[PDB]
Amino acid sequence: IDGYFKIYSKHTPINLVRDLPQGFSALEPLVDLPIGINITRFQTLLALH
Amino acid sequence: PLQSYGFQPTVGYQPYRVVVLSFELLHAPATVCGPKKSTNLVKNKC
């Protein structure tokens, strides 16, 4: 938003094997980077065995 | 096209070191600001 790249996160130990458990939690603000570029496309880096 | 600077190893011809501070004020969000002095806290006082 307006040149600020905001990253939110939260980590939770869970049991459900494949999907989100029924429940609720909120994500923390972490960092709000002063990143002055445009973004419209993206990709995920992954670990490969 | 380019000539060498005849700086001899020996005042108007003396080597002056110059630094130019060119300030980009719109290409990004604000990033550099001068520090400023704080002040002590006082309790129970408007």
Side-chain angles (χ1 to χ4, degrees), chain A residues 4-26:
Chain A
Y4 266 120
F5 204 74
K6 302 174 185 285
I7 309 308
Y8 298 75
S9 66
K10 180 176 173 74
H11 300 352
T12 305
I14 66 164
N15 54 10
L16 275 291
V17 161
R18 208 219 69 60
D19 61 357
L20 294 174
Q22 201 280 332
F24 182 41
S25 304

Side-chain angles (χ1 to χ4, degrees), chain B residues 7 11 14 25 31-32 38 41 44:
Chain B
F7 288 146
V11 68
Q14 283 311 317
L25 73 164
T31 193
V32 291
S38 295
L41 295 170
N44 300 112

Side-chain angles (χ1 to χ4, degrees), chain A residues 2 6-8 14 19 24 27 30 32-33 36 40 44 49:
Chain A
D2 291 331
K6 302 174 185 285
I7 309 308
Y8 298 75
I14 66 164
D19 61 357
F24 182 41
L27 315 187
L30 283 183
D32 296 332
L33 300 178
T40 61
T44 303
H49 186 271

